[PDB]
Amino acid sequence: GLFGAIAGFIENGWEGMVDGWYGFRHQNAQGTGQAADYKSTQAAIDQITGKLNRIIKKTNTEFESIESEFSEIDHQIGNVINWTKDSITDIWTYQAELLVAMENQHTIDMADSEMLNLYERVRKQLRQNAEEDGKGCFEIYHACDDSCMESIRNNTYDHSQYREEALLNRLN
């Protein structure tokens, strides 16, 4: 898609992730872990809730009957009414198809952008202590335990602490 993350450089989604829309998986010495990112998940849901508030709505305009259901109306004005209603219906059918098509395009791309924005936030945090694998993972060039992994997710990772160790492991 537009931002190249979802159905892009991230191969597939995680069916096993049920407590969030976006999140992290890690591997270190101590083993494996999964966690959802709250901020990114909520930003996406709040934007979709916004669309629904705007679209799931009718006009409060009161319309009366201009055609009788049970009696015959004048043939000439009947033809005018039939022409006008069919014309209005063609406009609303077109507007409905376009609205939903356009919104669906935006929803898919907005969701793609929130994934990319989380990825870029992490890349910038890790600075020179990690490198990108092209599948959405960062290879970290220092011992990163569950506290360190938690500090990346919570946006409190200090790159300067591990820089010396990391730069040596990267150059080898």
Partner 1 sequence: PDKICLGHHAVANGTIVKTLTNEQEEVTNATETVESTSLNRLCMKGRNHKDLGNCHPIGMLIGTPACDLHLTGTWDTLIERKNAIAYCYPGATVNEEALRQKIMESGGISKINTGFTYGSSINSAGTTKACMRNGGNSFYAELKWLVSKNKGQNFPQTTNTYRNADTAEHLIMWGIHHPSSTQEKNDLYGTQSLSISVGSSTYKNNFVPVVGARPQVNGLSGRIDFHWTLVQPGDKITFSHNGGLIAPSRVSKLIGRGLGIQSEAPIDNSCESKCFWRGGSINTRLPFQNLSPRTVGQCPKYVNKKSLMLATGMRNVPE
Give the three-class secondary structure for 121. Answer: helix
Q: Would you say 30 or 79 has its CB closer to ligand NAG? A: 79
Q: Is 76 in the site for a second copy (CB under 8 A)?
A: yes
Among 30, 34, 49, 95, binds a second copy (CB under 8 A): 95
Among 39, 104, 120, 158, binds a second copy (CB under 8 A): 120
Whole-number minimum distance, CB 85 to a second copy, in Å?
A: 8
**Which distant-in-sequence residues (6+ apart) come within 8 Å of 131 by Cβ?**
138, 139, 141, 170
Whole-number minimum distance, CB 84 to Ca ion, in Å?
A: 12
Distance set, CA 101 to CA 57, 95, 108, 117 (Å): 18, 10, 11, 24
Among 67, 158, 164, 165, binds partner 1 (CB under 8 A): 67
Q: Which residue is nearest to ligand NAG (CB)?
A: 78
Binding residue per annotation — 64? yes
Binding residue per annotation — 72? no
Element (H, E) at 65: none
Residue 78 tokens read as 């009947």
Spatial separation of the C-alpha atoms in residues 132 and 127, rounded to whole Å: 11
- Provide the 10 A C-beta neighbour count for residue 48: 14
Backbone angles phi, psi at 26, to 5 degrees: -130, 155
Q: Contact residues for a second copy (CB under 8 A)?
A: 1-4, 8-9, 54, 59, 61, 63-64, 66, 74, 76-77, 79-84, 86-95, 97-99, 101-102, 105-106, 109-110, 113, 116-117, 120-121, 124-125, 127-128, 131-134, 164, 167, 170-172
